[PDB]
């Protein structure tokens, strides 16, 4: 009756950052020692919570958010950060209690000639609220002229393809990111360590 952390970290395919997946974890026990002891993670940043002391705690809900971004954009997956990814794709609250775990996935997600399957939101009129997901493909109206769903002048597609060719630099290579959101309130428990 263990929590399905392997279904998230070792999933064959990750979602695009603009359509980041979230898995609800409840009514299970988990072993966090499989994390923070592995050497695969390039960045393992925790805010508010202690990953080392995670094995003897309990929580109500633990959300596992998954997506793929560039290495340059990994810094933006953090509370109080700004940028195209943080404002328009994935935003964390200023009181975020959890961990952001990232690693290099050049061997997995980077195809020869361009993956073209990972997209990010390029144009948006306002920034995202915390934990908001905008999966709209409506043509972005950059002027006063209506777009009528056809791209053109002042009318751009809101999403952009990452590319992800294996020969690019480390910054341009895809990075898989898993965001763990921890929450304790009332007393339902259902998410504890050993």
């Amino acid at each position, epitope marked *: 009756n263990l929590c399905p952390f392997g279904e998230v970290f070792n999933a064959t395919r990750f979602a695009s950052v603009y359509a980041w997946n979230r898995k609800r974890i409840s009514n299970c026990v988990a072993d966090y020692s499989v994390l923070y002891n592995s050497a695969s993670f390039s960045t393992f940043k925790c805010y508010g919570v202690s990953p080392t002391k995670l094995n003897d705690l309990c929580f109500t809900n633990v959300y596992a958010d998954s997506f793929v971004i560039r290495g*340059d954009e990994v810094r933006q997956i953090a509370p109080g950060q700004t940028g195209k990814i943080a404002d328009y794709n994935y935003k964390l609250p200023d009181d975020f209690t959890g961990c952001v775990i990232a690693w290099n996935s050049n061997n997995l997600d980077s195809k020869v000639g361009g993956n073209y399957n990972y997209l990010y939101r390029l144009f948006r009129k306002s920034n995202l609220k915390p934990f908001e997901r905008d999966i709209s493909t409506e043509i972005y109206q950059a002027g006063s002229t209506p777009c009528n769903g056809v791209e053109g002048f002042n009318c751009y597609f809101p999403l952009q393809s990452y590319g992800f060719q294996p020969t690019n630099g480390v910054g341009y290579q895809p990075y898989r990111v898993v965001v763990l959101s921890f929450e304790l309130l009332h007393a339902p428990a259902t998410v504890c360590g050993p």
Partner: antibody
Amino acid sequence: QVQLVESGGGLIQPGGSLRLSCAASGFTVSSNYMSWVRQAPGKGLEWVSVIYSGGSTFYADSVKGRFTISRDNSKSTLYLQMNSLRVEDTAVYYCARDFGDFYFDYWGQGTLVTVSS
Amino acid sequence: EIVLTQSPGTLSLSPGERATLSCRASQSVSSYLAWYQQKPGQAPRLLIYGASSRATGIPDRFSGSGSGTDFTLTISRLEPEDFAVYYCQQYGSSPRTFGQGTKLEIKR
């Protein structure tokens, strides 16, 4: 049609402040990335600052903490408040519409900012 | 800070010939390069974006080529109004940087 007309350039002593205006036409300034690009006399181009369509602000290191880019949707104008100006800042400042923080597709006529004592 | 280097410093060709320009990058930028034309006393004008895509209103005689660290802008059948200073700009990594430009003058 897209028009970018700039104002505010002139002569200012070192440490003095100076504000640049950029009246825009042909698009909504609140929905587009906009950037300032300066060019020192006889030198190459240098990016200065950009404002995202969502209001996010980013500046080059050489001007960070001194310049402050801003927009006014009501008047359709892009501003660049240049404070604590230095002799090195002497350049022609261009106002350019930015396509997703990648490239500048439309440019203004350019205004000359001269910083000297 | 990633530096763009343009060659030649100045190019001299007669009208009707083919002009080839170079832009070499400090690091690979992966087709995140643009080309700008600037006539004396005017603002830069966008020519190529994406290192190969042609901007709206740009004649077919301008073509962008290259990837990674090496890029090339070619102008065929030079017209007298095609002679100016041409800049390359990368947008692979912040901050975005330009080049020193390449002066293109008519030979007589």
